[PDB]
Amino acid sequence: RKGPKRHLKRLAAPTSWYIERKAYKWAVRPRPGPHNMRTSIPLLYIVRDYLGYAKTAREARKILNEGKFLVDGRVRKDYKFPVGIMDVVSIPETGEHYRVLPNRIGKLILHPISEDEAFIKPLRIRNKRMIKGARVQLNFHDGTNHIVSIAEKDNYFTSYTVLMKVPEREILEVLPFEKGAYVFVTQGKNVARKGRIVEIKRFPMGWPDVVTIEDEEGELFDTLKEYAFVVGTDKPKISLP
Amino acid sequence: MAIWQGRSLKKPSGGRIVLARKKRKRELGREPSNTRVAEQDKRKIIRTYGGNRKVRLTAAAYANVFDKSGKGRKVRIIRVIENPANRQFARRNIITKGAIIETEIGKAKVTSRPGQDGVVNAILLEE
Amino acid sequence: KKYETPPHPWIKERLDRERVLMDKYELKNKKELWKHETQLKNFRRRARRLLAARGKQAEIEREQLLARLKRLGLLPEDAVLDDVLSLTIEDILERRLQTIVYKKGLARTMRQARQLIVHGHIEVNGQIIRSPSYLVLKEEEDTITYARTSPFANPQHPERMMIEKAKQGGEA
RNA sequence: GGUCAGGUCGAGCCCGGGCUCCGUGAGGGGGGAGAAGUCGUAACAAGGUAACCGUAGGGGAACCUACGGCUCGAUCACCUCCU
RNA sequence: AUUCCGGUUGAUCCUGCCGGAGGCCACUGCUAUGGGGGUCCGACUAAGCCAUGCGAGUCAAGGGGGCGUCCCUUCUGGGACGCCACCGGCGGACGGCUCAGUAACACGUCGGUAACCUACCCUCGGGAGGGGGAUAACCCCGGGAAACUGGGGCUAAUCCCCCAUAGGCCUGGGGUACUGGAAGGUCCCCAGGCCGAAAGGGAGCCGUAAGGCCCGCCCGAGGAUGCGGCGGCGGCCGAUUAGGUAGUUGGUGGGGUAACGGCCCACCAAGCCGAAGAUCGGUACGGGCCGUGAGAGCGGGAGCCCGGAGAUGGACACUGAGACACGGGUCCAGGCCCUACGGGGCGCAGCAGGCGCGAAACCUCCGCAAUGCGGGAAACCGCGACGGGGGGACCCCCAGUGCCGUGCCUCUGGCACGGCUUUUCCGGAGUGUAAAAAGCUCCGGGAAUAAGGGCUGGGCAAGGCCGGUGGCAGCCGCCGCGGUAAUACCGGCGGCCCGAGUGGUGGCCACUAUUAUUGGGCCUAAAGCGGCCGUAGCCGGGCCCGUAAGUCCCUGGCGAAAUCCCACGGCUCAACCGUGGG
Numbered sequence A: 001r002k003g004p005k006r007h008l009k010r011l012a013a014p015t016s017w018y019i020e021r022k023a024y025k026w027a028v029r030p031r032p033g034p035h036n037m038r039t040s041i042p043l044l045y046i047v048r049d050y051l052g053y054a055k056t057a058r059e060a061r062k063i064l065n066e067g068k069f070l071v072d073g074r075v076r077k078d079y080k081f082p083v084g085i086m087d088v089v090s091i092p093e094t095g096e097h098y099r100v101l102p103n104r105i106g107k108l109i110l111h112p113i114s115e116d117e118a119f120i121k122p123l124r125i126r127n128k129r130m131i132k133g134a135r136v137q138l139n140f141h142d143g144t145n146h147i148v149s150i151a152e153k154d155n156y157f158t159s160y161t162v163l164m165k166v167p168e169r170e171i172l173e174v175l176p177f178e179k180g181a182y183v184f185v186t187q188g189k190n191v192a193r194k195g196r197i198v199e200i201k202r203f204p205m206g207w208p209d210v211v212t213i214e215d216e217e218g219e220l221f222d223t224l225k226e227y228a229f230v231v232g233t234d235k236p237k238i239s240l241p
Numbered sequence B: 001m002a003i004w005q006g007r008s009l010k011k012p013s014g015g016r017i018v019l020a021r022k023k024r025k026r027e028l029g030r031e032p033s034n035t036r037v038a039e040q041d042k043r044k045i046i047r048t049y050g051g052n053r054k055v056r057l058t059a060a061a062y063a064n065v066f067d068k069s070g071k072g073r074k075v076r077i078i079r080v081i082e083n084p085a086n087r088q089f090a091r092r093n094i095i096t097k098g099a100i101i102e103t104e105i106g107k108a109k110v111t112s113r114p115g116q117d118g119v120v121n122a123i124l125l126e127e
Numbered sequence C: 001k002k003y004e005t006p007p008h009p010w011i012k013e014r015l016d017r018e019r020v021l022m023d024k025y026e027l028k029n030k031k032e033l034w035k036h037e038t039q040l041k042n043f044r045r046r047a048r049r050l051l052a053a054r055g056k057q058a059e060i061e062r063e064q065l066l067a068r069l070k071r072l073g074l075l076p077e078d079a080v081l082d083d084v085l086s087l088t089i090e091d092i093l094e095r096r097l098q099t100i101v102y103k104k105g106l107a108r109t110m111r112q113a114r115q116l117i118v119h120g121h122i123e124v125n126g127q128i129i130r131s132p133s134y135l136v137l138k139e140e141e142d143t144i145t146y147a148r149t150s151p152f153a154n155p156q157h158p159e160r161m162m163i164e165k166a167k168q169g170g171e172a
Numbered sequence D: 001g002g003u004c005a006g007g008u009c010g011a012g013c014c015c016g017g018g019c020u021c022c023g024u025g026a027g028g029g030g031g032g033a034g035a036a037g038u039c040g041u042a043a044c045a046a047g048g049u050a051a052c053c054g055u056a057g058g059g060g061a062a063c064c065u066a067c068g069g070c071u072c073g074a075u076c077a078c079c080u081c082c083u
Numbered sequence E: 001a002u003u004c005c006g007g008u009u010g011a012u013c014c015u016g017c018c019g020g021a022g023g024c025c026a027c028u029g030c031u032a033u034g035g036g037g038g039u040c041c042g043a044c045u046a047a048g049c050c051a052u053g054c055g056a057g058u059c060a061a062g063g064g065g066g067c068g069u070c071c072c073u074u075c076u077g078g079g080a081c082g083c084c085a086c087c088g089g090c091g092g093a094c095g096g097c098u099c100a101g102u103a104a105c106a107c108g109u110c111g112g113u114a115a116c117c118u119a120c121c122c123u124c125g126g127g128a129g130g131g132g133g134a135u136a137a138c139c140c141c142g143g144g145a146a147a148c149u150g151g152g153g154c155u156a157a158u159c160c161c162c163c164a165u166a167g168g169c170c171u172g173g174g175g176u177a178c179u180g181g182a183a184g185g186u187c188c189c190c191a192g193g194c195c196g197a198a199a200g201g202g203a204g205c206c207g208u209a210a211g212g213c214c215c216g217c218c219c220g221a222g223g224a225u226g227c228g229g230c231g232g233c234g235g236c237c238g239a240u241u242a243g244g245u246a247g248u249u250g251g252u253g254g255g256g257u258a259a260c261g262g263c264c265c266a267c268c269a270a271g272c273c274g275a276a277g278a279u280c281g282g283u284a285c286g287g288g289c290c291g292u293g294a295g296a297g298c299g300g301g302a303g304c305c306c307g308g309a310g311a312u313g314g315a316c317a318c319u320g321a322g323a324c325a326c327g328g329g330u331c332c333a334g335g336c337c338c339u340a341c342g343g344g345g346c347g348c349a350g351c352a353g354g355c356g357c358g359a360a361a362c363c364u365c366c367g368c369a370a371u372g373c374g375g376g377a378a379a380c381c382g383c384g385a386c387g388g389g390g391g392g393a394c395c396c397c398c399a400g401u402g403c404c405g406u407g408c409c410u411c412u413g414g415c416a417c418g419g420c421u422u423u424u425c426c427g428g429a430g431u432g433u434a435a436a437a438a439g440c441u442c443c444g445g446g447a448a449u450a451a452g453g454g455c456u457g458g459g460c461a462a463g464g465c466c467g468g469u470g471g472c473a474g475c476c477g478c479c480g481c482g483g484u485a486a487u488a489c490c491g492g493c494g495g496c497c498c499g500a501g502u503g504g505u506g507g508c509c510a511c512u513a514u515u516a517u518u519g520g521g522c523c524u525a526a527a528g529c530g531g532c533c534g535u536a537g538c539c540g541g542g543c544c545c546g547u548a549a550g551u552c553c554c555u556g557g558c559g560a561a562a563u564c565c566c567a568c569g570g571c572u573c574a575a576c577c578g579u580g581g582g
Helices: A043-051 A057-066 C012-020 C031-052 C060-072 C081-085 C098-104 C158-163
Strands: A088-090 A097-102 A108-113 A128-131 A135-138 A160-165 A170-176 A182-185 A194-199 A210-214 A221-224 A228-232 B042-048 B052-059 B108-110 B122-124
Touching (some): A043 A057, A182 A210, C031 C081, C060 C081
Antiparallel strands (some): A088 A097, A097 A108, A128 A135, A182 A194, A210 A221, B042 B052, B108 B122
């Protein structure tokens, strides 16, 4: 290969989209964008398969273009687009709102939450670094970015909760993670769980960094700091298998 | 131009590594160009493969010559005396990153690559 | 494959078995018997494996296998993995379409339904089964009626007379 | 784009050597088969010369002799074991 | 799901080979594969080459027109579609095919580039001010059988450029603030140097033009995606291959690259590598898996998915984030074809199809409709990529070839004869076509109507007789059988097996503890070295103590999907596929 694959195959389409893998031979490959191709949920799958509102890709493309979905506050029109994890997907035309969440199974599920929560998108930022004018800027794994501060120490190192107002692309209500805060686990093999952090202590040097948590049941889990994602003091609800 | 890479010569055991394949364009190196001492600078603007624009020198005349707080000048050079990479290059008046030169008003030591940087800077010696 | 052909296939002892059962369960080919033998054999292999291993294999799986045997009727009410091991290849010949329609007595003998099933006159659930090797649940016994009928859409047809002569039921 | 000086990438052709495989050649050696021909009678009983062996020379051939070993050795082979 | 039999002999026991019985995979004979479902087909040949069709384009909503036509109007005049060439932009590096070479940091897994780039795309921030300018189209015109080619006047655009607004990059000195596991990348000031940003839109809608929906461009940062790079471990055979090496191992400076690097270079040194098998010859894409086997193990790399490699053989650059480029160019070698003989054009180990080869493998089909993708606001265009049917002893699965009375024989059955229902088959109906087909299925008429092949001395004791012939002709996998009452020949008859298959040959795995780890041996069956010595290596009495390397336990990161099992569901059914669990 000497070039981006423009075609994805059906036998190369995973079980995590919960798709029939012998259906044709070609699967919908999003164009590069926020998220990974196999860790995304296609716009084709959401209109066509999920809801029955299309019975051909022409139906679903025409339907998206006229409008039946806005993702993050802004317009889309083709079915090629990698929808991220911890995103906000909207049906304005039905008034449904979903979160893109893992199961224990590790398949992407759209989990319904109320119209209220569509406004919110929790960010836990990917890195934090200086840009010119001596201002630091916020980053994400869906590329969702904001600029402008005064530099300095600021709210956290990188483990944040932000409340994000999605039509405005604004940040509001900043909040640290603590040793009494909430995390939902959204990578690793311990996914779908939502609990209270016991302590954020870790193995102090080298590449491994552990963070540990307990829950409502109170099971003890260990996951990377990168695979800890701070919901807040809870903003979205749990994902169910 | 300069076929690389270049991991298909000999094994450190006296053996022969054969890795059957023909080169990539990205991996391949160019032929050297030589930066000459002149009264003028001769420059041309190329764009290297990657999508980065690089200033080519091919003759040169600057050495921009820094003090102890690094305050430069625009001043003209003369002959390369002492070239410690290859002593042959001092003669034929070719600048290097380790080069040591004559400049009008003092001697100095070249500290810049003239190939890709497109400018040659230098910091005065006490010599 | 659902064909089982043993290590020694023209031995005296196998051959006797086979010859005797041919209107005792209905054959017209050996293969049909081989399907049933393969279903049982795989079930007993799995049952053996789980019992062998410690409790550290996940009990959910042993629960799902045992469930299927309650419906099918091989373990009717039994709930024991050791009980699967003891099973005969004669308890799955008795759950054949041809020996469960004759049990109720809608088929004169097992031999009779080798043109009822072709011509489509024996229904189970909502559909005409066409297959002697079809295996019938305890659920499935509660709906055995007829459809797309021509000799049972005409009592006046002598077909109706040959099948039912004072009503020959059970299994033989 | 012209022509040419200096440097690098650089096939194709030619020349010689190295390595490795395949085809093949008068003539020559043995092998497995064949049916019938030819000589001897060696081995198997002790086969009428007990046999083997290493080494050395010789024989038409099976073989023979010398020396040392061995018996998986003949024999009632009787210092002795064996008798 | 773990099995043995014939054969060394007069008989016996051991040892040991051979043959056969099982699964699987080619090919080959007969017959058949009705009907129906899923897989599959130069797959162990010449990685041989091709006639002919075809796999690569697309925007006029960027753009001023040329032609036909439309709405008009029948004017001025503005609104459309097709067709047409030029710059723009994007795909053409992908998708598709093959696996020759390569035994290696090819590939897998974990690591890791803080050494490196990344356009289209996606995000957030900000920018697009002014000036300059062209060439097709059109008009006119020469040649070549052709390929192909032209010279000029005019001229549009998101056309091509410069400058500024800056930003970028280098370099010297000061210092903080973000990120880190650290090294230290990112901040800012300053000096001197260079390069020196950008472009817009028609009929509509939003804004005043720009701009935006839409399409695209610029700069800063990020993301995604692709490329390159480093390490741990795993990474074939022959020792009738034992010593190998001169950018070769290292140091120092440097060039060049996107970039680390003896990659390349100068200098300086003489190191580096090896018996836990170097080097050399030879063979081989690797992996998930698959085949077999109770396991251990053995065997394998095929459809299919993943990564790399190739595209007549070799060499070479340009444009692009991305090619040294599979239907592009330059050139050399071989070979083909056209030819006014001056001079041109190519590459089915891409797809149909052809031809050669051999033991072996398809229609010059149907469609762009669905699937994926590029461009386009969309409509829609392009697509032998693709969806499907055709053909094919290629595999698998399912199913039918009857049933009853019934005199009498071989009564787990058969045949005569009688009666009944009735797969194909006809007419009709849906399907489906996205227009065919595949014709089944359903309903009405309506028949017992597609069944063959092998074996019959012992192994398979599973299945027996007659006649001819007489150690013949022949049969044979093995042991054998025929020299005249032949179960073995040949023909006939009968029976037994299995069933759309049966049987044969070739190969692989089990049987084979004939590779011994599970699970083999060495007085005499094959096997103890003539004996010692001591090196490498292997192995170590009792008691204690330190380490916790080996060794056991627990948690957590992870070992792609598919393949496999179990469960349930759907298709009459099942194979199969979905889904969940393992």
